[PDB]
Structure 1
Amino acid sequence: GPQSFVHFTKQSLALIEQRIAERKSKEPKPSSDLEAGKQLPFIYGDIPPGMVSEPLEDLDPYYADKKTFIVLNKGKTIFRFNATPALYMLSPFSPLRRISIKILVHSLFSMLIMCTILTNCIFMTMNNPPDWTKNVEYTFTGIYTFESLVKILARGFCVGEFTFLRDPWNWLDFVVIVFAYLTEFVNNVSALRTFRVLRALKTISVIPGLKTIVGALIQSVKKLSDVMILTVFCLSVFALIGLQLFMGNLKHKCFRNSLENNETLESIMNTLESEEDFRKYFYYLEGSKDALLCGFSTDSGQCPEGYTCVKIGRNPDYGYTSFDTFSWAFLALFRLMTQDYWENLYQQTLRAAGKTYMIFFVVVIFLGSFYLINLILAVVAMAYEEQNQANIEEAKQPYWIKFKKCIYFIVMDPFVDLAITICIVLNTLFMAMEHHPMTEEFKNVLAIGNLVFTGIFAAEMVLKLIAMDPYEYFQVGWNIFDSLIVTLSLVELFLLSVLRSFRLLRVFKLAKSWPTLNMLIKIIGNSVGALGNLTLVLAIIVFIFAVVGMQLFGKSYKECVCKINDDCTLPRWHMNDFFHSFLIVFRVLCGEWIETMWDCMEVAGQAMCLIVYMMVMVIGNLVVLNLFLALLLSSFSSDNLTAIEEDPDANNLQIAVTRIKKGINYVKQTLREFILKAFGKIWWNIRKTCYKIVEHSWFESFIVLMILLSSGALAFEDIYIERKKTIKIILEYADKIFTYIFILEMLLKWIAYGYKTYFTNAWCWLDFLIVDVSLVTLVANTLGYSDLGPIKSLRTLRALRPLRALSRFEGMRVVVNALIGAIPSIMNVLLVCLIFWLIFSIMGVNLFAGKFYECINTTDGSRFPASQVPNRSECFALMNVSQNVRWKNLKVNFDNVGLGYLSLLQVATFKGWTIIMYAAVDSVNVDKQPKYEYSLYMYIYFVVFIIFGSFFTLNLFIGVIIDNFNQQKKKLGGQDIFMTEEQKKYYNAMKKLGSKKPQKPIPRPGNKIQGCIFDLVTNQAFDISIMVLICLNMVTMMVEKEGQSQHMTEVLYWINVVFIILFTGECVLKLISLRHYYFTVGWNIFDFVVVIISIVGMFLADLIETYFVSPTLFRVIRLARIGRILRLVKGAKGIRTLLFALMMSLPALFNIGLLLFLVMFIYAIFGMSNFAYVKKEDGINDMFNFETFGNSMICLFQITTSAGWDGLLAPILNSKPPDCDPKKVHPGSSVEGDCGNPSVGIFYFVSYIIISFLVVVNMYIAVILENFSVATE
């Protein structure tokens, strides 16, 4: 009832006084719909005029026993105050209190606070401020203290409930104000400035709605405790393994053999300091800051002649890349898990240790890097789903009319829309014809075409504005959008490159008839509508991190610049000003946090840089993951509610095509009428026998064996095969036997099944094609035409012989069926991605078409400073004088749209993007020498692309593929689509190990002493003691480092042996107690196995370091100690269920990995055939090339995770001199030239990184998600 708006008065105070007396004599829950900060329930109607902003009687009967009152605001919101006098001094009936209450509840007050904070956030962004900013900061301090004073006068400082301090954000405000006065009066200055950034967090309190978003983020991070415990445990175990294997291996360097003046290695090392001193004694690659790593094994790196490998000096990367201590190994393993610049660590470790150590990296990448990330993503997805389900549940709970009608007949016809769409597509494909060396006539025709198109669109705008008044035309969003684009077109016509590319957004008018291009627009709209608060929170967090980093490290980056740059000039990525600080933060969010962090530590301290970078990484990645998953789930579920019918009013394009097909039918019928008016019993048994043979298990197994042999025979064709002439001969004759073998299998299948039943089968078609290629090659070789151009090039298709195992192997067939099922949606999303990226490609072409050229000194590879050689003519004149000068260009650039696509791919995958960004921000003009950051703010182009392109396009791709797989599963009837029928039974049986009830306790024995042992060992105290013992053993394993003294080594050995005896004793006690019942438990036999292997390993390691010298075997055998610490899983129910999810998911991951390995084998054979002789550049070096099956597999595993593919592609884009030598003679071989094939290289790498994107990530995520959902149930 609206009569409840009674004022809080003296009689009300007296009534509360009598009620409190009755409460004292007395020696429920408040209404949620009436809680402060919400609107009044609609039962209370409209506020009376004299009651707004006045202390009203408490409307909630829950607070009828307490001196609390209510003040109502214009805008219908409730503030819940306290009637206990403020400061024990000012009663609620006071002029100051009334005025302050009105001020605090007014909305102009909140708007003023918001404006003040947003203004101060701009003065926060000055690396050095002008001397007059002290008055501005005094003004800001005055405004903040006035606001706090008003709040305190309104609701009491800290006197009971609903006072100033009772809100946790008022704590932040109070801390801000005391710091502001203490720093101005009591007066590290940089640390105090970092505390000025605490004033930015008041935006969350001021702006409505951000507080609940922050609370949701915190309640989400509270759900990740088990996953982070598992992550820390896994990283610790892998760090212990790495510290065992690679301890000190990264200190290997090549040292001079011949030393003068009786000098020794230690005498040399006690004197050197500078890199110019080290370069005289150790082998340094040209343009390298670190000494070249070598190794003592056969497959490690090779020192040059006259240099020998020794372990001395510091680790690479300023000394931060190492396994020499547990902390550094942990940092390396965290880097490996997050896959940030991990390929450099891969190559360094392989070179220092050996190429057989890639198994460690394989296991780490495919167990910790992918599975833990998928677990984190799945847990966050569950958290969002439950939160959204709760939200849904709570929500549920005279002469002018002549032309008006004429142009309305004209322009609103369905055909006009189709014509406009055709014109839009033509305009896009006409803008996409720009390149760098464009002749003047081509430029003229492009200008004329653009003029014609903008004229057509302007005429169409004028026609639709005279056919219907502005009051109705400007009522449509598409009409407003088209109007903006066209008026921009006329502006640019009357007057740039940007405003020319503004026209390209007209492509989004095809989203009406393109359902999977409307999903992209829905995602983009959700990012600024439903999830606008999440986006705003992310922006605020990024701003805060950028300003904090600048305030902390800007002065250090300028003081200590010679420690990180030889020229003593600021590097490319630094934190000396706000823009570069923001760039560093954004790069960290993109996922590159180690290369900038090394310079951070070098200039300003390991502790500070590590703390700041870890905070940034964790919080920023959490917020970005929340936004990503929210967008994905909201767009791909909430949009599915069957809102309106499927095109109720058919689109003008649909009506136009309906009319067109009607006219086609009419023309067909009329033309048809016009032209008609004008004018053996043994054969069946043979076939049955062939069927019986081809269907036999022996025949199938024989064929599978021959397929495997013929696939493996391809791996012996290295470049070193001329050293293996007997093997060459053997492999040639074996090829003929195999062709004869697969030709007879082909003829029996023809006579056994029938031509139709054969040729209507894709697997048989594939086998038919492969054996046809083999037969043609054999015939051509027999006739002597073995070198006939295309015939020779046809010999490279022998790498497809492995493709005959897909049909043979059931798991690989099951997996490959899902991909074929999902192909159409892949094509749809790929077309959407290409159309979307065409806009950015055309924009980049118009921005940087031909501006990446520069005049380099080819010996140093250093650009000549633009003071000398300011253009290409001066570069040419300088070449005429010198010799090692060149006017070079980047290999991946923006010269045309085709190369723009490759540059955009490199940017979007974050591999090789830095070179393009550097060239783009250096670019001056065409035929002009680039200057250092002449166009600095071209970084914004790449930022916007990485956001709109790299992020929303992955939100669209993941959604459509996960929907396709779900639809396939539902088509099969809720059956797993990655598991075979034989594996389904194992999966079903394993699913029952996660729910079996506890069995009966093992009965007590008969002997008295045995019973006492039983009561001792069956105890929670015993279990806890075993757990703490394992923890202590883990700590003793962590305390081991490189260079530890022999005394510490011996004491650690004895500490370990006593742990061995303790665990063996507990096992023996449990055996003598539980009799034969001990082995009925999986954890018990695991403990027994661990005990015996630990004992055996200790003995064997002692043997292999006493009667035999084999350090590698000793290091490997000492890994048996990790069994003692793997037992912590037994008592951790939080991580045990996640490991059960992994165990559940193993069967499907096996099939996926089998398919991936076959694909990698095929690509390795192709790489060996083609890129075996390219020039050693960039990522193609002496140890990572395509000259051998092992090297090829190493490179392909490296780029399966999409790492270093730019550096492997770069040497292949060479094709003409002086980049390559087409007539180079290779010793020991008949091949000539070291040039690459650009088209083949581009296709190879793009298709291989496309296969990995849809397999190692799209098939991996799905399997892990379903099985986590199963294990957590």
Structure 2
Amino acid sequence: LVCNPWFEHVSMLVIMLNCVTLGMFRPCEDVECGSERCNILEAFDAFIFAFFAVEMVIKMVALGLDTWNRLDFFIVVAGMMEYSLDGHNVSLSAIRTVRVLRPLRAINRVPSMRILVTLLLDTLPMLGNVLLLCFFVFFIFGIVGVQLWAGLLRNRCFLDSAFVRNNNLTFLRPYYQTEEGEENPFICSSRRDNGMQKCSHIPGRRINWNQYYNVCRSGDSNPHNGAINFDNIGYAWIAIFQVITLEGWVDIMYYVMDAHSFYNFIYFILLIIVGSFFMINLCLVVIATQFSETRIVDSKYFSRGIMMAILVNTLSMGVEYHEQPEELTNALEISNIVFTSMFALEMLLKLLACGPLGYIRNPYNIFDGIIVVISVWEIVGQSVLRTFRLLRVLKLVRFLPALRRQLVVLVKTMDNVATFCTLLMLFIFIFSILGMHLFGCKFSPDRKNFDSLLWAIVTVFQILTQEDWNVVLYNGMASTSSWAALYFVALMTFGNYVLFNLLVAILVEGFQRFRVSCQKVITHKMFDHVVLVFIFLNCVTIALERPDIDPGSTERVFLSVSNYIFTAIFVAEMMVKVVALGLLSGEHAYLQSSWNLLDGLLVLVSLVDIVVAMAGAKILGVLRVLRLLRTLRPLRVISRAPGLKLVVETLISSLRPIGNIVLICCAFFIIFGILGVQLFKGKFYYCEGPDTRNISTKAQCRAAHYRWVRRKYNFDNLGQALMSLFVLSSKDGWVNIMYDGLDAVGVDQQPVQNHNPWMLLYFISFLLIVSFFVLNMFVGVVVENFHKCRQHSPTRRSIHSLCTSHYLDLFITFIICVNVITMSMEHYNQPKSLDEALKYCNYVFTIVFVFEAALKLVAFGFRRFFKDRWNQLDLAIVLLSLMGITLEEIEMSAALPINPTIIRIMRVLRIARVLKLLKMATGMRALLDTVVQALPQVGNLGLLFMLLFFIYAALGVELFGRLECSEDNPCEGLSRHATFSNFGMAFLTLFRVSTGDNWNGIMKDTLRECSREDKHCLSYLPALSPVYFVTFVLVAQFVLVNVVVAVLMKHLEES
């Protein structure tokens, strides 16, 4: 019965049988319960539920009155309720959702997956300190958000009530809305605010009604069918949660910049730094520590000949592109024959030298043999075996022992990844079925739908990548209810929790006479400090450059002369140093260090700039190239600051251990790049027009007077494929590239939705494989740091007793906690009754804190009380609170000598009372202290991070400073808020690119061709744009990785 293993094996079979029936659910074909197919499936379910009841009875009888056993009971009890409740039509459908817990029974049946889930549950209790930090971020920013922006996103430009009445016309729509509709609302700034969007910015008619929408007042709905707003703490947390995921966070920012103030970016910068970066990466640090505590053939020249023969053949496959000349196609086929014969000859020579049994004795010769026959089969059989010619690159592993040793290391990591993958596939399946029940056939149909198991799994997988997940959120919120946000919050929170544990698992298994004067000047202690001043001043000059400076303005003269002065200063510095040290003769010569070589090249470029500028000559093309090299001057700061020099040298040395993983990843990119070109070249064209459902070919598009256009990210050649693959790997806009590959039909054919669903394998295989390599690169950097780190008064006494006792602290904690609850009840258009109640509560809290200060003064004495920092903090809040009440009362009275701006700030600043709770949080303070101890390392990397922004911010203004956006030339990433028009705006744009939020949209705007009528075009900008964004994205993320490592190592050593 229970003491035999076969009974469990029977239980496992039935558990798997349920998973099949659950996946067969059809949301809008099974809910009506009409089809015979549904009838048998429910019969199947009834059969299985009967066994699950029997299994309990036998086990209950055999053991009598373990978490997993309790789970078995809970599932059946709920199942019995649903099963027995049949007959009552009230909420019967809403009760069938309990069937999705059944696959959880497979956890206990599989031993390995049982042990893993035990560790996951045992690690949870030690995340309480991080969870407490999460509450502080959400509540501090949640309250600040509501008090600032409550009800502002309902603003719309309305018609005047008198205007519509007196003119006796009501055909106009009440408020201005774009032709698109309410999905692109025009949020205006009220009269009592200074938002960036006013009703005077409405475009004119394209018979002048748009100029009569001149009153800005609250509307009826918020953006996205009411999903995005700050009307109460409940909605402010959804906006804060979406920002922390870095998905569509700029859009939320732009809404409040239009409605409230431009300086609201400070709110979203701190939230991303504090909430997105530190608070999410502290989860990884805490788990990481906790988990740790818990005669001719054999010749070298012959081998080299084959090695280069394979390499040329593999690269020759990348010369394919869309419109190949037929002679080029033939050359590739002739080339295939030559290389095919060469490998065939090789097998013959080796077979004779060792014989068939000797030849088979080595696995690699077997692998090489199989390729030859398939390749020969292809020639004799003259598109299925053309794709298999990509396997020829795998032969290079034999000749690359260093790379071969890395491949086995990665493979050994996949033994413990498989355990987590099995848990994640079960995790995805449960949420895919759960979504089908909640949102099945209700997103009326969007491609991101839960209408079937295939696209429910794809949608759930997409949310885990955090790509357009907010689009799915708004659909779920609008269709069923606003509480549907908990489906996505639990899916993301639980999914990222499991993926951190996979990263930690790999880490732990990884741990297991004039010349005399010059010599004196350069050796002077103040030499670097003096030159560092001039370098800093040059930065101010570079940052003032922008395209809108008039050639004849005074500023242009100021900037132009400063260039002559600065170039003169930095040649003298080089000349003085060169004379002192010598150019290259002596051992201490000038060119014996790279940091000196860099300085010389910058000086050389500056001199050439003067020479060219001195030319009244056809040197316009060369001049623009020199302007780009003038933005690298700020690189001279690194050598002058010893802190920067050390960190910069540390990052370079960190790339050595992961050099081979990068090579394997780069080889992977080319292999998949070539494969994509063969599949998708010439098929990413489409017809662009208002009514295109009737078009099916290029010819019909021309007839309908539409335009036949190509996607920005395509696979027309290996150059275009590599750009597309990088956008996939970054997981920003990777769904749109996938859709194009799914819809591809052929050359000159209109793409059709979901034409080839089998292409999901191509795009989802690249995402997983590239993510695996990037996972092992992070582990490679950490392990290296670990290895190198380890190698290296009768009445007064009674009051004094009370203050010393813990009773006062517990009382204070209660008072602040209730003050926390009352601060969350504020919302837009709250009743006046609640206003008075909240105001009265403020009086009680202020009085309590005043008594709190008085008693401590009595107990400890004036100076001794003041010594404690916490006591100082207590005084500030009491003092701060007293002024807030005073300004509130006087303003509420007849006299009005105060600005409603000051009253708002004092109202907002009462959020500081939460800091009194930080005193009780001893565990949280220790967690914060770990970061505070890493500042010397994190501080220097921050300077490198801010230097990286300066160089690319100044380089962006030069390249993309003149791009325009208009209805004639629409743009997808750039807007009124995202531009490179000046250094100040380029800095904000790169911060968005740093977080990866629709950075692929910005790149598109730089790849789109120049107008035939416009001037100041740059013909090869499309070639330079991919380099600009690719390098910044890789470099910006790598620096942040080294910040995470610096904190991680300190937390390990600190224990």
TM-score, scaled to structure 1? 0.75
Deviations 1:447-476 (A, max 9, x none): 343455455556656776777677776676
Quote the Cα distance in structure 1 between the aligned partners of 2:399 and 2:576: 51
Q: Which letter does structure 1 place at the counterpart of 2:727?
A: Q
Partner of 1:1135: 924
Q: 1:102 to 1:251 in 2, by over 3 A?
A: closer
Given that 1:254 and 1:310 are in contact with CA atoms closer than 8 Å, whether structure 2 keeps it comes out as yes
Partner of 1:733: 561
Deviations 1:718-744 (A, max 9, x none): 233229822222222232222333233
Given that 2:227 and 2:477 are in contact with CA atoms closer than 8 Å, whether structure 1 keeps it comes out as no
Deviations 1:155-203 (A, max 9, x none): 55276469xx993354256447636853678884544543333332232
1:780 aligns with 2:566: no
Partner of 1:822: 654
Name the SS for the 2:708 alignment partner: strand
Quote the Cα distance in structure 2 between the aligned partners of 1:749 and 1:620: 58
Name the SS for the 1:806 alignment partner: helix
Q: Which letter does structure 2 place at the counterpart of 1:870?
A: S
Partner of 1:1196: 990
1:805 aligns with 2:637: yes
Name the SS for the 2:323 alignment partner: coil
Given that 1:550 and 1:576 are in contact with CA atoms closer than 8 Å, whether structure 2 keeps it comes out as yes
Out of 61, 66, 69, the residue aligned to residue 157 of structure 1 is 61
Deviations 1:1046-1074 (A, max 9, x none): 55334433422432232122112201210
Q: What pairs up with 1:1119-1268 in 2 under 5 angstroms?
A: 1119-1176=908-965, 1177-1215=971-1009, 1220-1224=1010-1014, 1232-1233=1016-1017, 1237-1256=1021-1040, 1258-1268=1041-1051
Partner of 2:474: 598
Partner of 2:704: 878
Partner of 2:421: 535
Structure 2 alignment gaps of length 5 or more: 204-210, 966-970
Partner of 1:131: 36
Q: 1:498 to 1:124 in 2, by over 3 A?
A: farther
Q: Which letter does structure 2 place at the counterpart of 1:892?
A: Y
Deviations 1:991-1050 (A, max 9, x none): xxxxxxxxxxxxxxxx22221221122221111000111111122222112223455334
Given that 1:1221 and 1:1235 are in contact with CA atoms closer than 8 Å, whether structure 2 keeps it comes out as no
Quote the Cα distance in structure 2 between the aligned partners of 1:758 and 1:1103: 71
Partner of 2:774: 954
Q: Which letter does structure 2 place at the counterpart of 1:869?
A: I
Out of 288, 293, 297, the residue aligned to residue 381 of structure 1 is 288
Quote the Cα distance in structure 2 between the aligned partners of 1:769 and 1:134: 80
Quote the Cα distance in structure 1 between the aligned partners of 2:507 and 2:337: 41
Aligned residues: 1024
Partner of 2:69: 167
Q: 1:1205 to 1:106 in 2, by over 3 A?
A: closer
1:895 aligns with 2:678: no
Deviations 1:789-832 (A, max 9, x none): 31353133322232222222333223212123234446544332
Given that 1:141 and 1:180 are in contact with CA atoms closer than 8 Å, whether structure 2 keeps it comes out as no
Quote the Cα distance in structure 2 between the aligned partners of 1:841 and 1:699: 51
> Larger Rg: 1 or 2?
1
Q: 1:488 to 1:253 in 2, by over 3 A?
A: farther
Out of 875, 896, 908, the residue aligned to residue 1088 of structure 1 is 875
1:713 aligns with 2:541: yes
- Alpha-carbon deviation of 1:354? 3.3
Quote the Cα distance in structure 2 between the aligned partners of 1:751 and 1:309: 72
Quote the Cα distance in structure 1 between the aligned partners of 2:275 and 2:48: 51
Out of 415, 433, 440, the residue aligned to residue 319 of structure 2 is 433
Partner of 2:115: 212
Name the SS for the 2:638 alignment partner: coil
Quote the Cα distance in structure 2 between the aligned partners of 1:491 and 1:106: 51
The root-mean-square deviation of aligned C-alpha atoms, in Å, is 3.5
Quote the Cα distance in structure 1 between the aligned partners of 2:50 and 2:179: 61
- Alpha-carbon deviation of 1:364? 1.4
Given that 1:1098 and 1:1118 are in contact with CA atoms closer than 8 Å, whether structure 2 keeps it comes out as no
Quote the Cα distance in structure 1 between the aligned partners of 2:887 and 2:55: 77
Out of 98, 109, 119, the residue aligned to residue 195 of structure 1 is 98
Q: Which letter does structure 2 place at the counterpart of 1:1168?
A: V
Partner of 2:968: none
- Alpha-carbon deviation of 1:1186? 1.0
Given that 2:681 and 2:715 are in contact with CA atoms closer than 8 Å, whether structure 1 keeps it comes out as yes
Query: Structure with the greater relative contact order (CA < 8 A, sep ≥ 6): 1 or 2?
Result: 2
Out of 179, 183, 196, the residue aligned to residue 300 of structure 1 is 196
Given that 1:243 and 1:329 are in contact with CA atoms closer than 8 Å, whether structure 2 keeps it comes out as yes
Q: Which letter does structure 2 place at the counterpart of 1:918?
A: Y
Q: 1:142 to 1:783 in 2, by over 3 A?
A: closer
Quote the Cα distance in structure 2 between the aligned partners of 1:1104 and 1:1166: 51
Out of 764, 770, 780, the residue aligned to residue 596 of structure 2 is 764
Quote the Cα distance in structure 1 between the aligned partners of 2:657 and 2:417: 26
Deviations 1:288-320 (A, max 9, x none): 722223436767235236354624223212221
- Alpha-carbon deviation of 1:935? 2.1
Quote the Cα distance in structure 2 between the aligned partners of 1:1088 and 1:496: 89
Given that 2:686 and 2:750 are in contact with CA atoms closer than 8 Å, whether structure 1 keeps it comes out as yes
Q: 1:1109 to 1:421 in 2, by over 3 A?
A: farther
Q: What pairs up with 1:480-495 in 2 under 5 angstroms?
A: 481-482=367-368, 489=375
Q: 1:450 to 1:156 in 2, by over 3 A?
A: same
Q: 1:1115 to 1:512 in 2, by over 3 A?
A: farther
Partner of 2:463: 588
Quote the Cα distance in structure 1 between the aligned partners of 2:246 and 2:426: 27
- Alpha-carbon deviation of 1:1112? 4.9
Quote the Cα distance in structure 1 between the aligned partners of 2:747 and 2:685: 8
The answer to which of 829-838 and 475-484 deviates more is 475-484
- Alpha-carbon deviation of 1:952? 0.8
Given that 2:403 and 2:660 are in contact with CA atoms closer than 8 Å, whether structure 1 keeps it comes out as no
Deviations 1:727-783 (A, max 9, x none): 222222232222333233333223333334322233333222223322332343345
Partner of 2:628: 796
Given that 1:210 and 1:533 are in contact with CA atoms closer than 8 Å, whether structure 2 keeps it comes out as yes
Given that 2:948 and 2:1036 are in contact with CA atoms closer than 8 Å, whether structure 1 keeps it comes out as no
Quote the Cα distance in structure 2 between the aligned partners of 1:1205 and 1:601: 26
Given that 2:956 and 2:980 are in contact with CA atoms closer than 8 Å, whether structure 1 keeps it comes out as yes
Q: 1:135 to 1:285 in 2, by over 3 A?
A: closer
Given that 1:911 and 1:1203 are in contact with CA atoms closer than 8 Å, whether structure 2 keeps it comes out as yes
Given that 2:364 and 2:398 are in contact with CA atoms closer than 8 Å, whether structure 1 keeps it comes out as no
Structure showing the higher helix proportion among its residues: 2
Q: 1:955 to 1:133 in 2, by over 3 A?
A: same
Name the SS for the 1:310 alignment partner: strand
Name the SS for the 2:156 alignment partner: strand
Structure 1 alignment gaps of length 5 or more: 1-99, 388-408, 562-569, 639-682, 880-884, 975-1006, 1226-1231
Partner of 1:244: 147
Deviations 1:1223-1244 (A, max 9, x none): 426xxxxxx3487711221211
Q: 1:576 to 1:371 in 2, by over 3 A?
A: same
TM-score, scaled to structure 2? 0.89
Q: What pairs up with 1:66-77 in 2 under 5 angstroms?
A: none
Q: 1:319 to 1:516 in 2, by over 3 A?
A: farther
Out of 990, 1004, 1010, the residue aligned to residue 796 of structure 2 is 1010
Q: 1:171 to 1:724 in 2, by over 3 A?
A: farther
Q: What pairs up with 1:258-277 in 2 under 5 angstroms?
A: 260-262=163-165
Q: What pairs up with 1:938-949 in 2 under 5 angstroms?
A: 938-949=759-770
- Alpha-carbon deviation of 1:1092? 2.8
Quote the Cα distance in structure 2 between the aligned partners of 1:520 and 1:259: 77
Q: 1:499 to 1:739 in 2, by over 3 A?
A: same
- Alpha-carbon deviation of 1:632? 4.5
Quote the Cα distance in structure 2 between the aligned partners of 1:838 and 1:1104: 69
